């Protein structure tokens, strides 16, 4: 469960991301594809090379979903319900892969927001991304 301090920390850190939201999402995907090449197979219709417009566009979608989750942090199962159906049913994304993308999102935030990425905020962000991952893996059928 996310504590009041966790929600405050996540909102504050994500607030600093700003107009870079989409960019950071795209960078996290790139980090995931390079570090954990098994994850690439979910995107055969994507060119996954650096500067790919498809990865850039997708990073914005990922960021927008995370922003939705931050904005509705006390109601995340509802806010992410459609995305949960998509990832678990249609795409059949292996639950391990959410841990991989969550790690790459943390690395991206650490690399861009050194003042915000305190040990406490790192912990809050990890709990938040784990909560998001728990919702997105909740619909396997």
């Amino acid at each position: 469960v996310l504590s009041p301090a966790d929600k405050t920390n996540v909102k504050a850190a994500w607030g600093k991301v700003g107009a870079h939201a989409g960019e950071y999402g795209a960078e996290a995907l790139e980090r995931m594809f390079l570090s954990f090449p098994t994850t690439k197979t979910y995107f055969p219709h994507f060119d996954l090379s650096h500067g790919s417009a498809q990865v850039k566009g997708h990073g914005k979608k990922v960021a927008d979903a995370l922003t939705n989750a931050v904005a509705h942090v006390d109601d995340m199962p509802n806010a992410l319900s459609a995305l949960s159906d998509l990832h678990a049913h249609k795409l059949r994304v292996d639950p391990v892969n959410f841990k991989l993308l969550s790690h790459c999102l943390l690395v991206t935030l650490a690399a861009h927001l050194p003042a915000e990425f305190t040990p406490a905020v790192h912990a809050s962000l990890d709990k938040f991304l784990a909560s998001v991952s728990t919702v997105l893996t909740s619909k396997y059928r």
């Binding site: 980090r31 390079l34 570090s35 650490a110 406490a120 790192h122 912990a123």
Partner: protein, 146 residues
């Protein structure tokens, strides 16, 4: 584990800039803060009640220094991590009984600390090289379980 020459270059070049007195303690402290069940193995370290308490704890910084030393030793023997980590494997697996998932977690926390310290210099390809390294180290530390 096999790194390309380009990856070896990226890894060694960055590691030479690492503050070896501080980065290990930062990684171990963050492990204890982010994954609080790991505190079970460090009751003798004293005050771990708050993140500030953890990060400022002299025993955490000192022990962190030893951990980083082991990672440094692994980087020098990428083609023989099993032999390099044999005594450490016996300690962590046979004596301490640490679940090996936590070896993976500490490696990933170290990667976050490197990203924090190096910023844009910690590029996605540099990260991918370090992920090979910390996976190699985790697998070697877990050998006594295999």
């Amino acid at each position: 584990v096999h790194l390309t020459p380009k990856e070896k270059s990226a890894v060694t070049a960055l590691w030479g800039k690492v503050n070896v007195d501080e980065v290990g303690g930062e990684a171990l402290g963050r492990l204890l803060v982010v994954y609080p069940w790991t505190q079970r193995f460090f009751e003798s370290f004293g005050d771990l009640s708050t993140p500030d308490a953890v990060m400022g704890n002299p025993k955490v910084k000192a022990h962190g220094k030893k951990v980083l030393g082991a990672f440094s030793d692994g980087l020098a023997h990428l083609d023989n991590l099993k032999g390099t980590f044999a005594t450490l494997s016996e300690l962590h697996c046979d004596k301490l009984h640490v679940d090996p998932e936590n070896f993976r977690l500490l490696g990933n926390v170290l990667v976050c600390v490197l990203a924090h310290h190096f910023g844009k210099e910690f590029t996605p390809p540099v990260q991918a090289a370090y992920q090979k390294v910390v996976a190699g180290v985790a697998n070697a530390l877990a050998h006594k379980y295999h």
